[PDB]
Each structure stands twice: as C-alpha cells, then as structure tokens.
Amino acid sequence: PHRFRPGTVALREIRKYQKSTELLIRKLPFQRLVREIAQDFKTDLRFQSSAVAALQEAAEAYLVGLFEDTNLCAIHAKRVTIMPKDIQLARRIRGE
Amino acid sequence: PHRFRPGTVALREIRKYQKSTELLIRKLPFQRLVREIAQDFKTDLRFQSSAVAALQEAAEAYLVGLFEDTNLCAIHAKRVTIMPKDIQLARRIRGE
Amino acid sequence: LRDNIQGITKPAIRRLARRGGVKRISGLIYEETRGVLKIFLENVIRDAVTYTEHARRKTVTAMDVVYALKRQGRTLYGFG
Amino acid sequence: LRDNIQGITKPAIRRLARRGGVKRISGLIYEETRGVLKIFLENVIRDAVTYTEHARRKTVTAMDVVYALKRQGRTLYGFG
Amino acid sequence: KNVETYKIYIFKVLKQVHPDIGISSKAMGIMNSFINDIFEKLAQESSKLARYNKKPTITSREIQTAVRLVLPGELAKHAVSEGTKAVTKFTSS
Amino acid sequence: KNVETYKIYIFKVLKQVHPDIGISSKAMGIMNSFINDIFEKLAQESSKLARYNKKPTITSREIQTAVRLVLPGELAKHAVSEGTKAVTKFTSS
Amino acid sequence: ATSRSSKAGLQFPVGRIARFLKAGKYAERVGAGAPVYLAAVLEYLAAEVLELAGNAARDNKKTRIVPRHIQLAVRNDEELSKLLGDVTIANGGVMPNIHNLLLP
Amino acid sequence: ATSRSSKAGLQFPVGRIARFLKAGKYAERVGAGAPVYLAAVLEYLAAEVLELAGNAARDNKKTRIVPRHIQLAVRNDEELSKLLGDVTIANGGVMPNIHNLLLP
DNA sequence: TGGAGAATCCCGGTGCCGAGGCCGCTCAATTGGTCGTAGACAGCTCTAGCACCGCTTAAACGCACGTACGCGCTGTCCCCCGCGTTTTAACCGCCAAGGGGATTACTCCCTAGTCTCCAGGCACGTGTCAGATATATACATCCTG
DNA sequence: CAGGATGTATATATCTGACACGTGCCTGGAGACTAGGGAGTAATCCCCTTGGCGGTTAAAACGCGGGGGACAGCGCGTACGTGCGTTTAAGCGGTGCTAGAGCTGTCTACGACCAATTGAGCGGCCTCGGCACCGGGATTCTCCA
Incomplete structure (x- = not known):
C-alpha cells in the first residue's frame, strides 16, 4: 500500500487547519465541561x-496561541517535538 | 597566585546582588541617555x-525581569551561557 | 456533571496544535493542555458567574462572558 | 546629546544579569540589552512627554513618569 | 427597543472607500464592536486625563492627547491630523 | 496645601497588629500609595459595574462584587467577610 | 437645520457621539469640539480597517468583506496589530506561518 | 458627634473614603454602606500586608519595616503576588533564587 | 527524471438563505435662548532645575590567560506518525414543558444638597534614637594541596 | 581530609540624619433635615433554555509497523571568567543663576439644558444574488524508484 513519509501529513494538516476558521473542539463535550466547571461556583445555572459559543471561541484561540508559543520554545531547544516542559516554560514567561 | 575556579565569583556576585537594593546603573550616564531620548520627542525639556530616579528604577527592574526570563530560556536549551536568541525568545513570548 | 475534561479528546488537541503550527506532539502534551484549559476556563467562568450574580440573574449571558474575557485583556469581537 | 547609550557599560549589564540570576553571559548580550533598554525607555518617555505636554508644562514631573509606567502595566510604588 | 449602532455610517465609509465591495452582517457587527471599543478606550483615557488635571470639562485637547496615548505611531499621527482638520472645518463655519 | 493621606490610619493598624514594630517614612509612602491604588481599582470596578446595570448608585453590593472581581481567592473571601461584618456593625448600631 | 456631521464634513454621527459622551458621565461638562474630533478619529480608524480588509478580500478574490478578511487585515498591519494585539476576532482564523526548521 | 469609623469599628476614615467616593464622580449617588464596606476592605488589605511585612522584618532581625521587607512580604504570599504580579516596589530588591543547574 | 499515488484546486451547476432595500414611526438631533462657570490669561514670585567646577577615587577597561562550556557529531533505539478497522457518540432535528428574566407600575425611602457646627488632621518645630557604618573579628568556604 | 587564604559574615562602638511627637488652626467630618428620585417589590408573560429522543454517520478509538527524532556520550577549540595594573569619569559638595511651575485675580466666552420641533434612524417585512457546496476535470505535490 501507498504510505506517505512521516511528517508529510503533519504539514498537510498544518496548512489545512491554518486556512480554515471552523471550530476544532466538539460542541457538546465543551458545553458539558463548561457546565461542570460552572457548577463549582454557583449551582443550578443556565x-x-x-x-x-464565546467561551469555546476564546478557549480555542487561547490554546492556539499557547501552542504557537510552545512550538517556539520547542524550536529554541533544537527540537521539533513539543513537550510539557515547553508549555510550562511558555506559561511561566507569560506570567501565568 | 590564588585563582578561584570560573563561576565561583559569578555565584558570589549572584548571591551578593540579589541581597542588595542599590541601583546598579550609574546615575549620570542614565540621566544623559534619558535626556537624549526625550530630546527626540520635545526639545528643551527639563x-x-x-x-x-523613577525612570532608572523602572528600567533596572524591567531589565532584571528580562534577564530572569532570559536565564530561564537559556536553561531550557541545556545551556548556562545566556545568548541573544534567549533574549529574543523571551521578548517574543512576552509580546514585545 | 463529572469527568468532562476527558471530552477534550486527543484528536481535538492535535487539531489545535496543527492550527498553531506544531509538527510533532509528545504524549503528555494532551494532559498538560487539559490542565491549562481547565485553569483558563475556571478563571473566565468565575468572572462570568460573578458578573451574572451581581445582576441578580441566574442565566449566564454572552455579555457576561465578553466582560469576563475583557477583564483579562483578551477582548473578543463578534459577540457585542 | 549624542551617543549616551554607550553609557550603559558592560559591568552595569553584568551586574543587572547577576541580580537576575545569570551565571554566564555571551558577548552580544550587551548590545542586545542596550537595544531593548532603548526601546523600553523610548516608550515610557514618549508617554511621559505626552502627559507633560497635555498639562502645558515644560518640566517632566515624576508623577508623569508614574502615570506612563502605569499605562504599560508596570505600576511603581514609592513615587506617589 | 431601538438598538443604536454605527452600521449606516460604517457602510457609508465603506462605499466611500470601496465603491463595489459589500460586507456581511458578521463583519458589520465586528466593525461596530471595534468602533465601540475604540470609543470607550478614548473616552476613558480623556476622563482620566481630565481627572489628573482637575478639569471638569472635556475639550478637543483631551481627545487629542488621548489619541496620542492610545493609538500607536503613524496611526496616531494620521488620526490627529484628521481630527484637527475636522475641528477646523467645524469651527470655521 | 493640606494633602490627605492614610499615614495615621496605617500606623494605627500597624500598632494594632504589631505593637512593638516601627516603620520608616518610605514604607509609609509605599503603603499609602498601595492603599490609593487598591482604592482606585475597586472604585473603577464599581463604576463599571454600575454602568453595566444602568444603576446610578454605588451600593455595598457593587463594592462586594468589585472585591470579588479584583481580589483573588482566599484574600477576596476574607475581604468580603470583613466588609460584611463592618457593614452589619454600622447598620445595626 | 444642517447636521453637525455635515457641517464638519464627517460621515460619522457627531450628534450621536456627543449624546454618548454626555450619557457616559465621563465628565461633568463636555466641550463643543470634543465630539467632532472623536468622530473624525473614529471615521479615520474605520476607514483604515475597511481599506485593509477590502484589500485582503481582493487578494482573496472575493467581493465581500468577511471576518476572516478583517483578521487578515489586522494581522498584516503593524500599528493595527499593536493596537489589536490582545483581541480575538470571531471566525478570524490565524495567520499562516510555518517556521523554517519545520520545513523538510 | 461619634465618628462613622468608630461606629462601624474601623480604624480607616469612613468619612474621608466617602468624600473620595463622591469626589471621583464614579456615579451620581453613593450608598450609605459603600464607604463602610470599602474602608473595611482597605483596612483588611493593609493589615495583611503590614502583618507579612512585620514578620519578614522580624525574620531579618530588624525592628523597623522598610520597603525591602514589604517586597519580601509581597513576593512570599501567593495571593498578594497574584494581585501584585505586575508591580515593582521601590528599593525592593529581588527574591534570592538561584537555579539548580547553576550550582556547582 | 519519472511514473504511480494521492492532494489540491477549480469550475460548473444548483440551491439558497442571508444582505440590501424599504417603510411606518418614533425618538433624538437640531435649534433657540439663557445664564452659571471656568479656564485661559496676565501678573508675580520663589524655587527647583540647570550649569559648572575642582578634585579624587573607585569603577571601568584593556589585556593576558586558563578553563570549561557550546556544539557538532555519532550511533541508537524507541516512540510518535501514518493507517487501516471498529464503534460510538456527537449531532441534528424537533417538540414539549417550564421557568425566569425583562418589564411595568408604584410606593416609599434614602441619598444628595446644604448648612451649621466642630474637630481632627495635617507641614513645620523638637528631640531622640534605631540604624548605617567603619572596624576589628570570628566564620565558613573553597581552591588547591 | 586538609591547610591556606578568602571573602563573608560577626560583633562593636558611634553618631547622625531620619523619623515619632508637639502645635495650632482651618478645612474636612458629623449632625440635621428635606424633597425628589431611585430602588425594591409585586406581578406577569412569553420566550428562551432545558430535556428527551431516535436515527445514523463520521469522528474517535484501537492496534501497529516503521522511520525518524530525541538523546546520551564524546572530542574540541574558543570565548568567557578571572586576575591585574591603569586611567578616567562618575561622584559629590558647593555655588551661582534663571526660568518656569504654582498660585492668585478676573472676566468673558462657553457649555448645560429644556421646550418645542423635526429629521433621521431603528425594527419589521420583501427579495434576489453572491457564495457554499459539490462532482468532475484539471493540476500539483510527493513518495518512490
């Protein structure tokens, strides 16, 4: 069978997803997660x-920016694979 | 003659300067630099x-924080010597 | 509602990383991302619920979320 | 006034790095630090001069600098 | 209730700058909210500026200085130019 | 001109919590400006909250919500408790 | 009865902006020239953003401005990026940017 | 003429804070309980910061609080450091922190 | 290069629901007086910012040298990517309840506004004292040794 | 270990300038009190938010070879720390000088504001047209070869 070299589909997906404006997280799981989080602050909320939708948009934008910074940190360390240390460093520099 | 191993005096200076609250840049050169910079915006300023003094305090605090972030970036890259790429990465993540 | 943080699946994290320009992803990235997402959502939802409670409402509106996001310097357009 | 950026000598930058926890310093760090310091001072002084010009004054007050620093999220106490 | 918005004027500016290009309602709302945000920023900057000098009134000078504080660089310069031109046109007739 | 400051009240609080510990004038200035900054933050938060609900009045509820928005976590909880206690003491007596 | 916007030669509602300034209780008095200056600044910023968005749509080869084009215009310009660095635009996508070391 | 401060059991100047609330023109009207609540919150925050600063001064074996001790108190507590993250204290110095990999 | 093998683009119909227009109608912008007000505008005055100068010393600084760290390389192995196959859960359309939030009166109460006291807080005069500050004096401390 | 310097603390006088404390007075607080406006409250209704449900599909799960990247070890040479005279420019105290912030009258433009008035704008319907999508063709990449 035909098999693409590892990584090729990765840049194909990179080019595809940077061109679209759709939402990448499924709506129902995110809605359930938001309700579960909000249950801790005030019960019986609607x-x-x-x-x-605004919460999902903001969360996806924030995660995209965080992954951009993580990729910068991983590239700084002469690596292509992003690692939890990269995310931790990015968040530490951002002041989070 | 007696010679300390490299990094011993560096650690001694690190311990010394983190304990003091004095200003590390000489006052007259910083005053002259601030006047030169302000000359570009409005002439004949007093x-x-x-x-x-406030400008010097803020500048020294900002540079200390920037060097802390630079040291974090240098440690991330498995290095102890800080490099211009570390400062550039730190500023890029901070959004500057 | 319980364990809905696992609803943010591995393909979702991978797509979010691809949109961000990431080429390879480690195994523990998914758990780290779930943790940071939980932190961000906790902060934003706390502020939004505070805004809702102040207005004596029981329904979290989009304007409350917009204000909560604006308070963190992440102003969001398209929901005014 | 000309070339006063060189007034930030190598020992001053080295001391600033030592206060920040840095152990070794590269050669080009001094030039990079001078550039970033010039950028920061340019921003803050621009805001302070704007505040001074609005008040129809010709002397830059410390309160103008405090306001300029506050506008950048760098609140400074001890000069109020 | 009548919800007041800048849609008509944004459309007028667009047709003045791009005669043959339309705009979707989503972009209309985005532009309206952007205008509202910039208005709020400039108004709060002017109010703080007035409070600093203890002046009870907001004049065109406060707006100009708020523009210089908020908008960056060449954008601020051009905005100041257009504001001064419009004020001169208004008080000249 | 008489410049109002919180120096006496800060000293009183210090002597209430640390009877034998003194304080320098620089620390007084720093504490006073910190109090001024926190006051300003809470005041603007309350004003924005009032504007959002179209209420022309700043009530203790606005201050409480501004406290919850600005102060973080357990600090905010303690501040809310002390504020409620003081308001109750003022009202009932 | 000529409108103030027409008198100052501005498309934006000088009168509505004056009402907004009074209603916001920003100051106890509001000058006569403040609404005109503010309207001019708002008109300039709107014209700049719409120009850049229309140019981006033209490069996209579409005849209508959409939030994607607005996001592209915002992220293409320097000073607008500085003004709108922290903002998130709904359905705006991201700027296509792939780092050099990731290329094969 | 009993003062409002002593009536509410607060050391801070409820009357002065009420005057400041009126002077800032934050709103047309202020409630009777707003100055008391705000004074209580300010007194609590001042008491907390002074408590930690005095403890830091005692650990330094000095009687007198100085800005160095205030900086130490701010950066020792998680809550205030979260509130005062973007703040630089005059003559405050820095927390002594040397990374593990820098040690010999 | 070059051929397969898949990926991207692109065009042509084809459907389609969302912009653009339009129309009663209401509110808000324009006008028109009118009168507190406030802010610029002189005038002045003192003070703080500047300008300078002698002199000294300690920090910058150039340089020689020793060392240890960056860094490319070199295998090496393992674990992330690509890729099928299940499988399952998100999704979507829809409908019924239900509840809750604006909304509209509506009354009353509470805060401004003001004025009359009254009081405490606030910049200089005292006085004094904890804290810097050299100065010996141990105390770790660290490179040799 | 261990000895020999080596800054680094570790006491110890000491004096001094930086702060707790009087002081007086006037400018804030407290009290009284009133009218009007805001806010709470009580109803009220409809619309929006939830809950269920069923079908059914495409995404998520689930192994699983395989290749490519992390990564530890390894030479190596260079650039950074570190002593070491040397010089120079910051510090610093004092002194003259001047210019401009701050404060004080003063009055005239200049804005609030409201009652008619009216014009433009906003909500609720028509309508058609750019555009999304979807097969097939064209193109283009990309691995293999």
Missing part, C-alpha cells in the same frame, strides 16, 4: 448558547 | 530629579 447558559445562553452565545455564552458557550 | 527633568525633575525624582522623574529620572
């Missing part, structure tokens, strides 16, 4: 659909 | 002494 969410407008636009509120959950 | 500076209150407390204004220059």
Whole structure:
C-alpha cells in the first residue's frame, strides 16, 4: 500500500487547519465541561448558547496561541517535538 | 597566585546582588541617555530629579525581569551561557 | 456533571496544535493542555458567574462572558 | 546629546544579569540589552512627554513618569 | 427597543472607500464592536486625563492627547491630523 | 496645601497588629500609595459595574462584587467577610 | 437645520457621539469640539480597517468583506496589530506561518 | 458627634473614603454602606500586608519595616503576588533564587 | 527524471438563505435662548532645575590567560506518525414543558444638597534614637594541596 | 581530609540624619433635615433554555509497523571568567543663576439644558444574488524508484 513519509501529513494538516476558521473542539463535550466547571461556583445555572459559543471561541484561540508559543520554545531547544516542559516554560514567561 | 575556579565569583556576585537594593546603573550616564531620548520627542525639556530616579528604577527592574526570563530560556536549551536568541525568545513570548 | 475534561479528546488537541503550527506532539502534551484549559476556563467562568450574580440573574449571558474575557485583556469581537 | 547609550557599560549589564540570576553571559548580550533598554525607555518617555505636554508644562514631573509606567502595566510604588 | 449602532455610517465609509465591495452582517457587527471599543478606550483615557488635571470639562485637547496615548505611531499621527482638520472645518463655519 | 493621606490610619493598624514594630517614612509612602491604588481599582470596578446595570448608585453590593472581581481567592473571601461584618456593625448600631 | 456631521464634513454621527459622551458621565461638562474630533478619529480608524480588509478580500478574490478578511487585515498591519494585539476576532482564523526548521 | 469609623469599628476614615467616593464622580449617588464596606476592605488589605511585612522584618532581625521587607512580604504570599504580579516596589530588591543547574 | 499515488484546486451547476432595500414611526438631533462657570490669561514670585567646577577615587577597561562550556557529531533505539478497522457518540432535528428574566407600575425611602457646627488632621518645630557604618573579628568556604 | 587564604559574615562602638511627637488652626467630618428620585417589590408573560429522543454517520478509538527524532556520550577549540595594573569619569559638595511651575485675580466666552420641533434612524417585512457546496476535470505535490 501507498504510505506517505512521516511528517508529510503533519504539514498537510498544518496548512489545512491554518486556512480554515471552523471550530476544532466538539460542541457538546465543551458545553458539558463548561457546565461542570460552572457548577463549582454557583449551582443550578443556565447558559445562553452565545455564552458557550464565546467561551469555546476564546478557549480555542487561547490554546492556539499557547501552542504557537510552545512550538517556539520547542524550536529554541533544537527540537521539533513539543513537550510539557515547553508549555510550562511558555506559561511561566507569560506570567501565568 | 590564588585563582578561584570560573563561576565561583559569578555565584558570589549572584548571591551578593540579589541581597542588595542599590541601583546598579550609574546615575549620570542614565540621566544623559534619558535626556537624549526625550530630546527626540520635545526639545528643551527639563527633568525633575525624582522623574529620572523613577525612570532608572523602572528600567533596572524591567531589565532584571528580562534577564530572569532570559536565564530561564537559556536553561531550557541545556545551556548556562545566556545568548541573544534567549533574549529574543523571551521578548517574543512576552509580546514585545 | 463529572469527568468532562476527558471530552477534550486527543484528536481535538492535535487539531489545535496543527492550527498553531506544531509538527510533532509528545504524549503528555494532551494532559498538560487539559490542565491549562481547565485553569483558563475556571478563571473566565468565575468572572462570568460573578458578573451574572451581581445582576441578580441566574442565566449566564454572552455579555457576561465578553466582560469576563475583557477583564483579562483578551477582548473578543463578534459577540457585542 | 549624542551617543549616551554607550553609557550603559558592560559591568552595569553584568551586574543587572547577576541580580537576575545569570551565571554566564555571551558577548552580544550587551548590545542586545542596550537595544531593548532603548526601546523600553523610548516608550515610557514618549508617554511621559505626552502627559507633560497635555498639562502645558515644560518640566517632566515624576508623577508623569508614574502615570506612563502605569499605562504599560508596570505600576511603581514609592513615587506617589 | 431601538438598538443604536454605527452600521449606516460604517457602510457609508465603506462605499466611500470601496465603491463595489459589500460586507456581511458578521463583519458589520465586528466593525461596530471595534468602533465601540475604540470609543470607550478614548473616552476613558480623556476622563482620566481630565481627572489628573482637575478639569471638569472635556475639550478637543483631551481627545487629542488621548489619541496620542492610545493609538500607536503613524496611526496616531494620521488620526490627529484628521481630527484637527475636522475641528477646523467645524469651527470655521 | 493640606494633602490627605492614610499615614495615621496605617500606623494605627500597624500598632494594632504589631505593637512593638516601627516603620520608616518610605514604607509609609509605599503603603499609602498601595492603599490609593487598591482604592482606585475597586472604585473603577464599581463604576463599571454600575454602568453595566444602568444603576446610578454605588451600593455595598457593587463594592462586594468589585472585591470579588479584583481580589483573588482566599484574600477576596476574607475581604468580603470583613466588609460584611463592618457593614452589619454600622447598620445595626 | 444642517447636521453637525455635515457641517464638519464627517460621515460619522457627531450628534450621536456627543449624546454618548454626555450619557457616559465621563465628565461633568463636555466641550463643543470634543465630539467632532472623536468622530473624525473614529471615521479615520474605520476607514483604515475597511481599506485593509477590502484589500485582503481582493487578494482573496472575493467581493465581500468577511471576518476572516478583517483578521487578515489586522494581522498584516503593524500599528493595527499593536493596537489589536490582545483581541480575538470571531471566525478570524490565524495567520499562516510555518517556521523554517519545520520545513523538510 | 461619634465618628462613622468608630461606629462601624474601623480604624480607616469612613468619612474621608466617602468624600473620595463622591469626589471621583464614579456615579451620581453613593450608598450609605459603600464607604463602610470599602474602608473595611482597605483596612483588611493593609493589615495583611503590614502583618507579612512585620514578620519578614522580624525574620531579618530588624525592628523597623522598610520597603525591602514589604517586597519580601509581597513576593512570599501567593495571593498578594497574584494581585501584585505586575508591580515593582521601590528599593525592593529581588527574591534570592538561584537555579539548580547553576550550582556547582 | 519519472511514473504511480494521492492532494489540491477549480469550475460548473444548483440551491439558497442571508444582505440590501424599504417603510411606518418614533425618538433624538437640531435649534433657540439663557445664564452659571471656568479656564485661559496676565501678573508675580520663589524655587527647583540647570550649569559648572575642582578634585579624587573607585569603577571601568584593556589585556593576558586558563578553563570549561557550546556544539557538532555519532550511533541508537524507541516512540510518535501514518493507517487501516471498529464503534460510538456527537449531532441534528424537533417538540414539549417550564421557568425566569425583562418589564411595568408604584410606593416609599434614602441619598444628595446644604448648612451649621466642630474637630481632627495635617507641614513645620523638637528631640531622640534605631540604624548605617567603619572596624576589628570570628566564620565558613573553597581552591588547591 | 586538609591547610591556606578568602571573602563573608560577626560583633562593636558611634553618631547622625531620619523619623515619632508637639502645635495650632482651618478645612474636612458629623449632625440635621428635606424633597425628589431611585430602588425594591409585586406581578406577569412569553420566550428562551432545558430535556428527551431516535436515527445514523463520521469522528474517535484501537492496534501497529516503521522511520525518524530525541538523546546520551564524546572530542574540541574558543570565548568567557578571572586576575591585574591603569586611567578616567562618575561622584559629590558647593555655588551661582534663571526660568518656569504654582498660585492668585478676573472676566468673558462657553457649555448645560429644556421646550418645542423635526429629521433621521431603528425594527419589521420583501427579495434576489453572491457564495457554499459539490462532482468532475484539471493540476500539483510527493513518495518512490
């Protein structure tokens, strides 16, 4: 069978997903997670659909930026594979 | 003659300067530099002494924080010597 | 509601990384990302719930989320 | 006033690095530090001069510098 | 209730700058919220500026200095130029 | 001109918590400016909260919500408890 | 009765902006020239952003501005990026940027 | 004429804080309980910071609080450091921290 | 190069629901007086910022040298990517309840506004004292040894 | 270990300038009190948020070779720390000088504001048109060879 070299599909996916504006996390799991988190602060809360949509948009944008910084940190260490130490360093420099 | 191993005096200086609260840049050169920079925005300006002191304090604090982040970036790359690439990475992650 | 943090699956993290320009991903990246996502969502939802409670409402609106995000310097357009 | 950026000598930058926990320093670190210091001072002094010009003054007050630093999220106490 | 927005004026500016290019309602809302955000930023900057000098009034000078504080570089310079031109046109007639 | 500052009250609080410990004038200035900064932050948060709900009044509820928005975690919880205690003491007596 | 916007030659609502300034309680008095200057600045910023978004749409070869084009315009310009560094635009996507070391 | 501060059991100046709330024009009206609540919050924060600063001064074997001790108190507690993350204290110095890999 | 093998693009219909327009109608912008107000505008005054100068010393600084760290290389192995195959859970359409949040009166109460006391807080005069500060004096401390 | 310097602490006088304390007075607080406006509250309704459900598909799970990247070890040469005279420029105290922040009258432009008035803008419907999508063709990459 035909097999692409490792990494080729990785850049193909990189080029594809940077071109689209769709949401990458499934809506129902994120909605459930948001409700579970909000349950700890105030019980019996209701969410407008636009509120959950805004939360998902902000979370995805934040994670994309965090992964950009993580890739920068991993490249700095002469590596291509991102690692938890890269995320930790990126968050530490950001002040989080 | 007696010679300390490299890094011994470096560690001694690290311990010494983290304990003191004195200013590390000479006052007159920093005052002259601030006046030269301010000359580009509005000519014939006068500076209150407390204004220059506040500028020096802020600049030294900012540089100390930047060097802390640079040291973190240098340790990330399995190095002890800090390099311009470390400063550039730290500034890029900070958003500067 | 319990264990919905596992609802952020490995393909979702991989797609988020691909959008960010990442080429290879380690194994523990998924757990680290889930932790940081939980932290971010906790902060934002705490601020949004505070805004909702102040207005004596029981329904979290989109404007509360927009204000909460703005308070962290992450102003979001398209939901005004 | 000309070439006062060289007034930030190598020992001053080395002491600033020692205070920050740095053990070894490369050669080009001094030039990079001078550049970044010039950028930071340019930003802060621009904001301070704007504040001074608004008040129709010709003397840059310490309160102007405090406001300029606050506008950048670098709140400084002891000069209020 | 009447929700007041800058949609008409944003459309007018677009047709003045791009005669043949339309705009979607999503971009309309994004532009409206951007205008509202910039308005809020400039207004709060001017209010803080007035409080610093203990002036009870907001004049065009406060707006100009808020523009210089908030907008960066050439954007701020051009904004100041257009503001001064518009104020001169207004008070000249 | 009489410049108002929190030096006496800060000294009183210090003598209430640390009877035998003194304080320098620089520390007084730093503490006073810290109190001023926290006051300013809470005041602007309360004003924004009032503007969001179209309420022209700043009540203790606005201050409480500003405290929860600005102070973090257990510090915010303790601040809310002391504020509620003081308001109750003021009202009931 | 000529409108103030027409008198100052501005498309933006000088009168509405004056009302917004008064209603926000920013100051106890509001000058006559403040709404005109603020309207001019807002018009300039809107014109700049719309120009860049239209150019980005033209390079995309579309005749309508969409939030993707606005995001591209924001992230292409330097000073607009500095002004809008911390903002997130709905459905804006990201700037296509692949680092050199990742290339084969 | 009993003062409001002593009436609410607060050391901080409820009257002065009420005057400051009116002067800032944050809103048209301020409640009777807003100055008391704000004074209580300010007094609590001051008491906390002074407590940690005095403890830091005692660990340094000095009687007198100085800005160095205030900086130590701010950076020792997680809550205040979270509140004061972006703040530089005049003459505060830095926390003595040397990375593990830098040791011989 | 070059051929397979898959990926990307691209065009043509084809459907389609979302912009653009339009229309009552309401509110808000324009006008028109009118009168507190406030801010610029002189005038002045003192003070702090500047300018300078002698002189000294300690920090910068150039340089020689020794060392240890960057760094490329060199295998090496393991674990992340690509790729099928299950399988399952998100999704989507829809509908029924239900509840809750704006909203509208509506009354009352509480805060400004002001004025009349009254009081405490606030920049100089005392006085004094903990803290810097040289100065010997141990105390670790670290490179040799 | 261990001895020999080596800064680094470790006491010890000592004096001094940096702060707790009087002081007086006037400018904030406290009290009184009133009218109007805001806010709480009580109803009220409809619309939006939730909950269920069923079908069914495409994404998530689940092994699994295989290749490519991390990564430890390894020479090596160079650039950074470290002594070491040397010089130079910052510090620093004092002194003159001047210019401009701050404060104080003063009055005239200049803005709030409201009652008509009216014009533009906003919500609720028509409508058609750029564009998304979707097969097939064209193109282009990409691994293998």
